[PDB]
Design a protein around this ligand. Structure first.
Ligand SMILES: OC[C@H]1O[C@@H](O)[C@H](O)[C@@H](O)[C@@H]1O
Ligand SMILES: OC[C@H]1O[C@@H](O)[C@H](O)[C@@H](O)[C@@H]1O
Ligand SMILES: OC[C@H]1O[C@@H](O)[C@H](O)[C@@H](O)[C@@H]1O
Lengths: 478, 380
């Protein structure tokens, strides 16, 4: 108080922060409290069930909040917000059961080492759950819908084997505003929701996380917006690690906002997700460990960018992220379905075998980019061409092999332009080729070997197949 | 447990035993560093209080322990005979007032599986304090780290013994490369799911405690640059101004070297090439040796050496192949000096050569390699 004395908090919305405990602004008087099977029901409309504030080291077992009164949730004897907790480091909630209407449990600020094991949190049905507006939440969370578990301001509660049902949002977690502190930790959540209604399972704001999936889960009915994960403004240094088993039924994995990918697939068991699920937004995946696919399928006509692209029945549509995708799953080939796969700005091609009836086109003066060593092979395609730019811009000093066994037309430009002091071997096999020079370079000498085995070629350059910035190691023509 | 000297001590047979959500703390850390452990393995001779001590084959599972005000959070020794007894700590919540601490995990002759929860720190001594101390862990042991590193910078590991055993298993490093330190890189065995594009070296202002993968915290010596580049899949090495020198044969990763620094091999040493790929020296102040052959190739895989800087092997060679090799050497501009560009210790090595510079030893234009090398192409 102003006069220096202390008054018991009687405000429903008040919760002490770690700062308060150090400022002397707040003093806790919650200690040596143990709860065993306490059942708490409430009249409909009551705001909060239990305010677990300042309960450091306090424990709970079988605390059960809310009554399953009947089908209509608006008349059920349960609270809008089940439990609200802060300044409770070292507290343990064993087998906590909550029946809520708006928010199940909320954890804010200091809760170091606190644990919530085998919690069973569920909204009483999901009817109109999407209209529920969260009461205690981080500023970064502006979405509408009920939330089973909410955590923010640096609270890092360990959630072990929770069972979450009928929630729009299973988890909403935000790291500390200043330094993204507060790891979102959930081990094997059993998530279920009647009629598959759901918005997101993990809505993660400015934070890192470690989640182990147990083969149980789903993504909502909205084909564009709903996804298991939503990463809102997670910093470049953060990692949102996914381990375990993906749900059996197809789901859309991730969507987000922000300029940095943070999702990590750490030996994740994807089951049949490539065939029946969707990645959603490939941009947010930072890295993949122990998950491989042999081929990436592209279909400019029937493809869907939401797809993984690694299963033939679910190809992606554009070439924008093919290099990224091939690096992640170590793809050995790319299959181009019938139609013209095009780019309007410089795009990287992975050093793999391209096959199929499709064709490749570089429009608006763009070029395909080669940034890695290895062999890029175009075998049996309907052709590759550009509308004016050089076809392949090489920016790596490593050995680059370019194997074209399809029609090639760079028009007045080069098939290959080395932007560095390169080392390239190019080989044209049958079909046809057109260009002003097969290989060129921007400056200081590039070494190259060339084989052109086709009658349909620019015969006027047989004597001078490359520019002055390229020195030949071998030349096989005619 | 509130203790003065040791919180809990677990010894010998404790198969399947578990300690869940323990809250173990010294009553403050005042003079904690002067406490002497009473029940401890012989291999632990440090002074300082210990929250949890385990040895003689004991393998209790520690789930979500909360450890506070300790000099040593955990001291664990594997069984003397065969290193039996896995050190298992899942998500420890470690804290200490004023940041006072010696080590969090002091591991002796053992393996371990630890998952970090983004909470922790390393002590105030800039030389000796570290999250991990690996003492004499055997070659077959593995000390696995998963989870999130603390937010604030810490020194990750120090150790004694001849074998590296630390494993970063998809560890979320946060900003540790920028604000923390590895400590002793020697002890890291392998790294999964953690990358960095560039390794920074600074022979004048660098610090070997640093990770080296962030420009504001470069390392100082060349000793472990191959190992570091292999672990974090680095694509380039940046040499800050000054001479980066070796006095013993040292491996160079097959990446792009850039920056104003120079490379120097002294005491008759040679730089080693043990892997296939392309080694590129671009824009450096130069590379030279005081008498040893410049690059000793010990791999039979295709090796490309691309030097776009001053090169001076004196009376020796630029490249010497110690096996039946396959090499492509290209010198671009600047200058090159040597007795032969490429040579080999024995039974024929194949090589391709391009020298694009007026400042070269014209005298060997017609005979650029020794008798043990056969040329595929010669462009001078
Ligand atoms: O395929 C997409 C990838 O292409 C690469 O060339 C770019 O460097 C990345 O920014 C991008 O994610
Ligand atoms: O601490 C050493 C580092 O200081 C930085 O300010 C410089 O940019 C680096 O070139 C140098 O290696
Ligand atoms: O970079 C340091 C590394 O160099 C290698 O050539 C050695 O074989 C390793 O034992 C060493 O760890």
């Amino acid at each position: 108080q102003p006069d220096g004395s202390y008054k018991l908090n009687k405000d429903v919305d008040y919760y002490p922060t770690g700062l308060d405990i150090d400022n002397g602004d707040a003093i806790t008087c919650a200690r040596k409290i143990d709860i065993n099977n306490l059942n708490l029901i409430t009249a409909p409309g009551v705001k909060v069930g239990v305010k677990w504030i300042g309960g450091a080291g306090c424990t709970t077992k079988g605390l059960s909040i809310g009554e399953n009164t009947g089908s209509d949730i608006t008349t059920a004897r349960l609270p809008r917000v089940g439990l609200l907790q802060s300044a409770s480091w070292g507290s343990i909630h064993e087998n906590l059961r909550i029946l809520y209407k708006t928010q199940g449990a909320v954890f804010i600020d200091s809760n170091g080492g606190a644990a919530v094991n085998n919690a069973y949190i569920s909204r009483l049905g999901n009817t109109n759950g999407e209209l529920e507006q969260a009461v205690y939440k981080p500023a970064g969370f502006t979405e509408v819908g009920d939330v089973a578990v909410t955590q923010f301001a640096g609270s890092e509660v360990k959630f072990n084997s929770p069972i979450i049902e009928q929630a729009s949002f299973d988890f909403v977690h935000a790291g500390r505003d200043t330094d993204s502190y507060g790891l979102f930790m959930v081990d094997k959540p059993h998530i279920e929701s009647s009629g598959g209604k759901k918005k997101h399972s993990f809505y993660l704001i400015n934070t890192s996380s470690n989640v182990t999936l147990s083969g149980v889960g789903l993504s909502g009915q909205d084909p564009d917006l709903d996804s298991m994960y939503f990463l809102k403004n997670c910093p470049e240094t953060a990692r949102n690690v996914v381990r375990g088993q993906m749900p059996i039924s197809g789901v859309k994995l991730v969507r987000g906002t922000g300029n940095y990918p943070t999702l990590v697939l750490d030996c994740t068991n994807m089951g049949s997700q490539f065939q029946f699920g969707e990645v959603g937004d490939i941009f947010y995946i930072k890295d993949v460990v122990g998950v491989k696919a042999d081929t990436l399928y592209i279909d400019p006509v029937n493809g869907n960018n939401y797809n993984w692209g690694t299963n033939g029945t679910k190809p992606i549509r554009e070439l924008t992220n093919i290099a990224k995708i091939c690096q992640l799953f170590r793809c050995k080939s790319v299959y181009l379905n019938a139609g013209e796969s095009v780019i309007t700005s410089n795009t990287e091609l992975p050093m793999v075998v391209f096959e199929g009836p499709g064709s490749l086109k570089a429009n608006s003066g763009s070029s395909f980019l080669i940034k890695a060593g290895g062999t890029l092979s175009l075998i049996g395609l309907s052709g590759i061409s550009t509308d004016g730019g050089h076809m392949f811009r090489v920016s790596t000093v490593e050995k680059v092999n370019i194997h074209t066994n399809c029609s090639v037309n760079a028009g007045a430009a080069y098939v290959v332009l080395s932007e560095v002091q390169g080392n390239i071997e190019y080989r044209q096999l049958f079909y046809s080729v057109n260009c002003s020079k097969y290989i060129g370079a921007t400056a200081g000498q590039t070494i190259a070997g060339i084989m052109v085995k086709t009658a349909t070629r620019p015969t006027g350059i047989d004597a001078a197949p490359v520019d002055g910035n390229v020195s030949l190691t071998y030349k096989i023509i005619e």
